[PDB]
Amino acid sequence: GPRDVALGSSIISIKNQALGGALLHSHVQPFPEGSEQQQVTVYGYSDANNEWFFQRIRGVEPWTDAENKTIEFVKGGEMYRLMHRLTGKNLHTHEVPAPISKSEYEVSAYGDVDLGDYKDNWIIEIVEQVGEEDPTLLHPLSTSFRIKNSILGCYLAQSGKHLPEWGFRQGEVVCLKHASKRDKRTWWNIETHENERLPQGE
């Protein structure tokens, strides 16, 4: 994949860095309780349901494919939405107990490019850059980053718990309250990166 992730046109999968860390995932299956919205999980194999792309925050006009004039790069410290590619939904959280980790917040996929709320805005916080590439940008594999909800202030995390059979026993994803900086369940990296507009990164 290309070395720098772009807003909108970069298709990425995102891997958790804790032990047993897997790929951020969504599918057209609802939570049976909680908010009953579309599930978000982690999955262990390559799959089109692992594909996400970055979108502009709620509050400004969104990026669209017809925007051929400009390529913008995702920057540490800035806010973005994360869109599930196949379903078009926003990575979402809210003050709802998580399915298994009842003291944490449930994470779902909700809405679309136009519909949702400001809990779809996440701060991308870069916490480690391997190599001497632009420290402000996201690079596949070498960048570790955290995903902090702009409204609730919690961190996206692979909890370590497994969902029941209704979540195909995939891994629970939560928004951790009071996470430590060095809690690797809240550390993520770009695993795969696809973008036809960018120089390929050999």
Numbering used by the authors: 331 to 532
The authors write:
PMT-based O-mannosylation is an evolutionarily conserved and vital process, key for cell wall integrity and protein quality control in fungi. In these structures each subunit has 11 transmembrane helices (TMHs) and two large hydrophilic loops oriented towards the ER lumen (LL): loop LL1 between TMH1 and 2 harboring a catalytic DE motif, and loop LL4 between TMH7 and 8, encompassing a so-called MIR domain, whose function remains unknown.
While MIR domains of the PMT1 family proved to be unstable when analyzed by nano differential scanning fluorimetry (nanoDSF) and failed to crystallize, PMT2 family MIR domains were more thermostable and readily formed crystals. X-ray structures were determined by molecular replacement using the MIR domain of the stromal-derived factor 2 (SDF2) from Arabidopsis thaliana previously solved in our laboratory. The high resolution of the Pmt2-MIR (1.6 Å) and Pmt3-MIR (1.9 Å) structures allowed for a detailed analysis of the respective structural properties and ligand interactions. Given the high sequence and structural similarity between Pmt2- and Pmt3-MIR domains (68% identity, rmsd of 0.7 Å for 194 Cα-atoms), we focused further analysis on the Pmt2-MIR domain. An almost identical arrangement is found for Pmt2-MIR site β in the MIRm1-MIRm2 interface. Taken together, we identified three putative ligand-binding sites in the Pmt2- and Pmt3-MIR domains. Two MIR-motifs form almost identical surface cavities and are conserved in all PMT-MIRs, while the third site is specific for MIRm3 of the PMT2 family and is highly solvent exposed. Our analysis of high-resolution X-ray structures of the Pmt2- and Pmt3-MIR domains revealed particular ligand-binding sites (α, β, δ) on each lateral side of the triangular cap region.
